[PDB]
Amino acid sequence: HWGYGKHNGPEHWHKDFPIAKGERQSPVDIDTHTAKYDPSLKPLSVSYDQATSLRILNNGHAFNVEFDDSQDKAVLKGGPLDGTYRLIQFHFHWGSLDGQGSEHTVDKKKYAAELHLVHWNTKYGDFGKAVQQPDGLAVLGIFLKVGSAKPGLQKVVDVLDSIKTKGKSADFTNFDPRGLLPESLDYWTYPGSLTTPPLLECVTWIVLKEPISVSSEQVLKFRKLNFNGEGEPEELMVDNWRPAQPLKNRQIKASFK
Ligand SMILES: NS(=O)(=O)c1nnc(NC(=O)Cc2cccs2)s1
Numbered sequence: 001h002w003g004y005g006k007h008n009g010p011e012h013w014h015k016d017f018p019i020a021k022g023e024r025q026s027p028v029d030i031d032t033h034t035a036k037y038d039p040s041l042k043p044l045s046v047s048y049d050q051a052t053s054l055r056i057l058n059n060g061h062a063f064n065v066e067f068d069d070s071q072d073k074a075v076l077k078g079g080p081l082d083g084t085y086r087l088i089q090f091h092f093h094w095g096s097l098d099g100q101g102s103e104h105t106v107d108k109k110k111y112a113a114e115l116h117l118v119h120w121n122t123k124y125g126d127f128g129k130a131v132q133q134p135d136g137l138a139v140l141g142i143f144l145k146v147g148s149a150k151p152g153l154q155k156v157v158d159v160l161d162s163i164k165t166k167g168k169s170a171d172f173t174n175f176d177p178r179g180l181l182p183e184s185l186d187y188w189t190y191p192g193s194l195t196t197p198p199l200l201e202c203v204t205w206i207v208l209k210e211p212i213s214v215s216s217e218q219v220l221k222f223r224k225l226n227f228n229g230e231g232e233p234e235e236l237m238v239d240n241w242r243p244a245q246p247l248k249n250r251q252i253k254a255s256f257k
């Protein structure tokens with residue numbers, strides 16, 4: 001099955017998922033000088049005050065913190081979006097070294113990790129229907145650099161020992177995702193895809209300009225997770241990022257000058 005190793009990594013995905021070579025694949029390199037300011041772009045509206053987190057799961061590729069999305073509790077609106085997108089889960093991609101780990105790059109620069117807050121368009125009724133639509137998802141992407149600790153990330157870091165291996169889950173209630181956001185909501189936006197199989201071209205990507213800083217100890221704990229299940233040979237969950245894909249016929253728009 002697919003993964004991030006030598007024999008099943010991103011260069012192999014197209015064999016099971018031919019859309020891997022499609023017209024709107026993600027991630028991409030964000031060339032900041034080529035991105036065009038669009039003064040018609042609205043400010044982002046992030047309303048996470050009523051967010052209800054449920055649990056955290058190691059899925060063998062990353063870990064997902066999942067939310068109750070059966071009501072408008074945590075929603076993303078505005079920006080390039082029409083309508084309301086409901087938060088369903090967040091996860092990260094990270095490196096084996098601080099010099100790599102992000103999926104999007106900025107003028108070819110790689111960050112240590114990248115946070116993805118995944119939202120689905122409520123007009124499609126549920127996530128499964130939404131991913132079949134070109135405007136089905138909105139993923140808010142936030143870069144992580146190594147520096148000062150992010151206090152709002154610590155509760156995530158501390159539960160990771162309980163989900164070390166593939167298939168392990170733990171209760172994860174009352175987590176506030178607002179503690180993962182940077183100060184500024186200036187963003188770049190472009191139409192793209194899921195960055196893991198099935199690689200569906202259903203995502204409006206909104207990537208924040210300002211990274212958050214996390215500590216060396218915090219990202220070190222991400223790297224102690226396992227791709228494998230318990231009782232299988234240990235393989236550290238690191239470098240679970242897809243590299244930049246061709247931009248093709250797309251324009252990246254910026255919300256800021
Ligand atoms: N890296 S990414 O954000 O582009 C993604 N790639 N695949 C994804 N699949 C899902 O979010 C399905 C799930 C919904 C709720 C729990 S899992 S997100």
Ligand SMILES: [Zn+2]
Pocket residue numbers: 091092093116195
């Ligand atoms: Zn992701």
